[PDB]
Symmetry: C3
Subunit: 394 residues, 3 copies
Amino acid sequence: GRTAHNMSSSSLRKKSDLRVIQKVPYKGLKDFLSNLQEVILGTKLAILFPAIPAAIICTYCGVSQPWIFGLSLLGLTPLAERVSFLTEQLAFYTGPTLGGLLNATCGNATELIIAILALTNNKVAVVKYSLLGSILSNLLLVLGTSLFCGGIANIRREQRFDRKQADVNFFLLLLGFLCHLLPLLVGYLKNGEASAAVLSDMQLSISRGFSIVMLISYIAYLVFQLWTHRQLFDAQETAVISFWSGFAWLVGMTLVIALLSEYVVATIEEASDKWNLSVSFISIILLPIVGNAAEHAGAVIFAFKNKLDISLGVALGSATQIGLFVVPLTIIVAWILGINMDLNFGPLETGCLAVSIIITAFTLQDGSSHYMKGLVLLLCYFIIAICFFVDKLP
Amino acid sequence: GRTAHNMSSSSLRKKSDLRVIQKVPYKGLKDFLSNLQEVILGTKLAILFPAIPAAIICTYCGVSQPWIFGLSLLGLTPLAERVSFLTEQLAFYTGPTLGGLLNATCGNATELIIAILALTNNKVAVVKYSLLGSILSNLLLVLGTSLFCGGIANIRREQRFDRKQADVNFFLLLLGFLCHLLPLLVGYLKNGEASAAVLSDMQLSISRGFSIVMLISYIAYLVFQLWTHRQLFDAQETAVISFWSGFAWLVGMTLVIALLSEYVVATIEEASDKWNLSVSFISIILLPIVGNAAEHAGAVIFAFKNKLDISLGVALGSATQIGLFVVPLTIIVAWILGINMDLNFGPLETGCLAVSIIITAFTLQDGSSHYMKGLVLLLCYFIIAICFFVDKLP
Amino acid sequence: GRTAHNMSSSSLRKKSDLRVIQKVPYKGLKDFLSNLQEVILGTKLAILFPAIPAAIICTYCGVSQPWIFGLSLLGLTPLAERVSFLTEQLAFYTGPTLGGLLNATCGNATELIIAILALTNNKVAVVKYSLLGSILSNLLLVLGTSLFCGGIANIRREQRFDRKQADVNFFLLLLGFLCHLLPLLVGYLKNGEASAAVLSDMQLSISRGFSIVMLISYIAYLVFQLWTHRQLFDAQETAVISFWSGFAWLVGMTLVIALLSEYVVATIEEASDKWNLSVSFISIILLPIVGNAAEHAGAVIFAFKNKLDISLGVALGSATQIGLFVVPLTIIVAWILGINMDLNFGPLETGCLAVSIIITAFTLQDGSSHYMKGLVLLLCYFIIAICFFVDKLP
């Protein structure tokens, strides 16, 4: 049996069989050209790989920073797909339990490296928008496109899913919303004869005590999902690359993601001036699209097959990891380094997170779906996108 | 098959058969006295028709403005019933699909003409209270009286409804609540070093971009309700007036509604002083009672018959039209004329709209009902009515 | 048939049969030593009864106030259990209907006497925290420990409850939340050119008009629960003490609770300084633990027996009585005496009450349970406890 993310990781794989240059005339370079054809050429997004050496040469030549920022997003779009592919090529050699533990802590690898490299460069605002923008993308854009495109193709058939597997995710997202609401309400307590230095050290001290509780709720979620109630999770039912070759490519792709994520962070303020876009719009709308490349194109294919237990397991499972594992890990790392970071996102950002959890919880509680459920979730994503397009706050 | 509003439009009809003055001694004036008896005398609210010529004569004689405002509400109470009756006397000559399109854009005719005539006379506050007061009336007063009066008469029987027909309405009302919450939160961003002229042009510019998205969500709702999923809407199953006579009375009643709606708008500030009532209380409590005259007395009769699919189709269907067709149409008309109008209702008004959608969504999600569900919705309407009675804000 | 609280009141009873000192050698003092062994020694919390005469002697000797406050909480912990035991020893002599009326108005006896004795001593803040802390304790701590400890012991069996008996409680808690939200939003209307004396008399005047509506919704709840829909409430199925002996002990225990509740109120400000704890933390966390002694240890035992209709009837039934009978009764008593008290708890307290009702309503709407539902409700209680531990607001 496979997990819900093993099924959806091989959705953009293209079978590449040259068998003319490599197979027949060669005798010695047979294994080296087989690993290279499988990993590099073996995808549907292989036209974006020349954007990786283009951004490195433009860095060491002196091209202006809006050109580097444009090419370093097209480079990370196939790299986030290969890392989310080579991990499931290790799950055949490790098993569905241990493979589900490497997938639960390294599923969102691009959203994790950006949120740390922007944290160490004192850009705490860019950390907060990109982590919020990855929760709203999975709840509204990835989930809305699945129920709308899979609801027009299957308009004459019957569409059902299991409620009990997806209700655990909305319980944890409401525990995470409480950890964002309460630092926001402390900052509106200025009537209590306390200065600005008193209210700011209270927001920082409760946000660091909340992050320990949020990590305990995610460790217990993994025991639920992998061992105690596995029976409703492996209801979905071979590796090509050898193990020690697949371990070497995974270290190689991670250093190139961590290299191109430095170009995104260092060239985001000047790319905002020359494009006349706010820094809040680029970080919350455009930048989470790079990470959700194979999850977004893997939950839609399993909606045309009317398997809506896989579309919900990818969309809701990746938003619980951002909200309760990647957000409270950033607070603990800032606790060690000594950087003032709390769970206060803002009044306009908390109100968008509140409605997005409530409208998703009412949509998915009868166990059936049609195309009108998936359109309301799309149009709520454009309302959020118009609001941060206009909000050019200097 | 009929719609849910065809069944509930003929609920206040009284059969008037004189057959002494008209039928026997006359020979020539037979058709003219038959249309006049059917339309004018053929209702249960025919004692309120002398209030229409009384308000016109008191206008041209010089009677003080609190007398004109009292009589111009009693005049519009049978006129809103005749327009909501003569349209369904055109649905027998047009069909259930085309007749459902004329009913979906002209169902709330009194709330539409008041909201435009008050807009062109620079009374933007009276527009915002009367459109909010028509959503809260349908969700709490019309829906609460149905489930309470139909839950005492049927206390020994079993009361059920179809959830899937009514869940589409609560998805759109949560999309509409997001378009009211976000202009409210921009006005609390005064910490971002922006003046009052900067925050006010941001509220106006996002409210005009939201209104295009709100109209697209209602056009797709009509395709859902009339053509794709008609099968759950015509589950409910002859015209008297000729077609070209019924078209002539519909133009005549609309001009008299548009005449008496001018008297309501022009005499609402002095009627507030002489009665010692706030302008917010008259517009949000008393004034939506005039429009919901046949919907309120048509959803209760079909609760004594234990047909709760018709009580929900009238109450929830008329609150989606106000919230997503009549509210965003007023923003587009003010965009053309050049009147500064946004979707900001206020902090006390948005908090009442938020709880009224949540408590109605939890009440109607098991598919059954009893009298205790309908009493909580009534007592939440009196809590809102006490709050705006005391709030006399100069 | 018994109620849901008759079953859970005798959960801490210990059978005490000496039969050596009393029974054999004595002939005259047989009935007096039988009532004394049944009431005093007949419990599992009988080691805390020496804390009652210790707090009285330390009062009349001159011991410092942090010592009296510590002993007067250990005294009230078995006294709240005996009063919640001797009332059900009167229900066998009165019946399940009249006995359910004495239990519905005297179930929370310790939270009622503290909220009045602190009201008459001008400590209105201590009244508002202890009444909020008894709603949050029953929804999160009592209900979360039941579903977690009864979900590990019954992990191989099937856990179900009846939704329709518990959905009435969440309808009334949302009617009560609206009565707390609207006085909070009037205090943020400072832009309307009104002074501080105008906004404060508007909060007081609507809070006294809301309390009449909240009491009418609870009287109708008792008619629902006891007479009209009793059939779903007595689905659960002998007294030892004579009636006129049990009436005499009930008057005696009430005067000692009302005596030790004076020591808690008079020694709470100096016990806050010498312990370096805020007055908000003691009143909202530590002090409601004293009242929920037999309800908390009576809903867990019936979760090991897989009878989750009794665990929900005790937890949710005691939070509706606090929120809609004990909170609006305190406003009416302050209306008579002339003490300025409204339903404004505060911005940080209203946001905790809002999320606690929503996360409890989504958890209990499929009719089944497991251990992961009960852990999220526990960890939401610690997030609230960390927030008021740090909030030391002078």
